[PDB]
Design a protein around this ligand. Structure first.
Ligand SMILES: O=C(O)c1ccc(-c2ccc(Cl)cc2)cc1NS(=O)(=O)c1ccc(-c2ccccc2)cc1
Ligand SMILES: [Cl-]
Lengths: 240, 237
């Protein structure tokens, strides 16, 4: 095909171990999630992959995944672009709550509504939320307008602010012939995959991208995939 | 008063900093990594905040920057890499230790090279073990034939670092962005010589310490208002 695109979803984070909603909270990789990134990078190295530019979020679990991959493939010198638009979905007032606290506060009916819905956001992160200043007042978002900084996001919102970055900053690089690597999060990568494959809301909500595994797209000159997404790795890792 | 921080990377693998590592892409040793960690810890303790970072395309500098950004919880910062901040290219001497250099070229010529601002070492030729490793490296593929060195005098190194400083770094400083630069002894010499207006002989005796944040406070014309200072505990300072 004319073009080749590689995605990688970061692995386990510190708060995954606590089954707490991270969202825009900047949780680091757990040691196991770091090892996952190292295995994904080794897969890219064994296949001889070369990139020309990298994109990631402003969250360290994705950035550290990217760093680990670049180290493994000896491409630490590549240009790297970070954007809040590739951030994980913003889970609003659920941020910092674990599974039990969420079910206790909201009930299983409401939690199922949020789980299955494309466009119903969770409650907003209010100024009295324990992570309100930690996230909403972080200087890394100082250049966002009022309408850009979310208090909460549905998946629709997340995809809606990821796709402008895809269209305006990544697509031109791909059509410039640059080999792109994107290291980001489940829901922002969902936005990209939905656009690439023309998936429905139903189909994108049942899509669970594997973590720490390079996801390879072969694209024609209009950035239409010519075959299903492929996973790189040894036989066992790919099967799972 | 603008604040500018420089950091020079520490020790590289296989004693290569004592072997004219130059443009060979040597990684940090564990000790050089630990040095970078201590420097980042010093910056964290002092509460330093940056808005943009500049580094070379050499992994010992890049990894130093990464270690510092990790220690100060600023991994989200924009990072710009450029070959123009690379270490001096030591030509045919790259990879040789002191004794091997003296055996190959004689003590007289080595003293001349050591003391000279404008005399380059001999060029890296196709028989050098690093020749294709460096000159055909993909990261330099956009460089024109006149830009990719086979060797550099100190004058050459400073001459190709300063255009990046002027065109890319200075405008950031003048917008009020707090700049961090992680690079190498001789490219940082280029910056310091431009900042302080040093003579060739002065810059040639200046040996910046490794792994230590180097802090400049500049006036509105980017002139230092005071001497460079070092962050850290009292003994290391
Ligand atoms: O049970 C499910 O599989 C499930 C899956 C998705 C969702 C969901 C998605 C979006 C919204 Cl806006 C709300 C809910 C809720 C679920 N049910 S849950 O018992 O409340 C729960 C809640 C947190 C986690 C969790 C959090 C962080 C790290 C690891 C695990 C795991 C489970
Ligand atoms: Cl980076």
């Amino acid at each position: 095909a004319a073009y080749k695109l590689v995605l990688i979803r970061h692995g386990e984070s510190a708060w995954n171990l606590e089954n707490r909603f991270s969202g825009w909270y900047d949780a680091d990789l757990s040691p196991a999630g770091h090892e996952e990134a190292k295995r994904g990078g080794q897969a890219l190295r064994d296949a001889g992959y070369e990139f020309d530019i990298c994109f990631t979020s402003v969250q360290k679990r994705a950035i550290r995944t990217l760093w680990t991959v670049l180290d493994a493939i000896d491409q630490m010198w590549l240009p790297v672009v970070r954007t809040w638009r590739l951030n994980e979905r913003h889970y609003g007032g659920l941020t910092g709550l674990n599974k039990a606290e969420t079910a206790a506060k909201h009930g299983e009916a409401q939690v199922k509504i949020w789980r299955r819905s494309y466009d119903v956001p969770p409650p907003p992160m209010e100024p009295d939320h324990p992570f309100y200043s930690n996230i909403s007042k972080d200087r890394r978002y100082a250049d966002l307008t009022e309408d850009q900084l979310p208090s909460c996001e549905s998946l629709k919102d997340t995809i809606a602010r990821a796709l402008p970055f895809w269209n305006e900053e990544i697509v031109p690089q791909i059509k410039e012939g640059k080999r792109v690597l994107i290291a980001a999060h489940g829901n922002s990568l969902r936005g990209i995959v939905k656009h690439l494959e023309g998936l429905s809301e139903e189909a994108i909500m049942e899509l669970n991208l594997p973590t720490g595994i390079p996801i390879v797209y072969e694209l024609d000159k209009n950035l239409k995939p010519i075959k299903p997404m492929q996973f790189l790795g040894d036989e066992e890792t790919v099967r799972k």
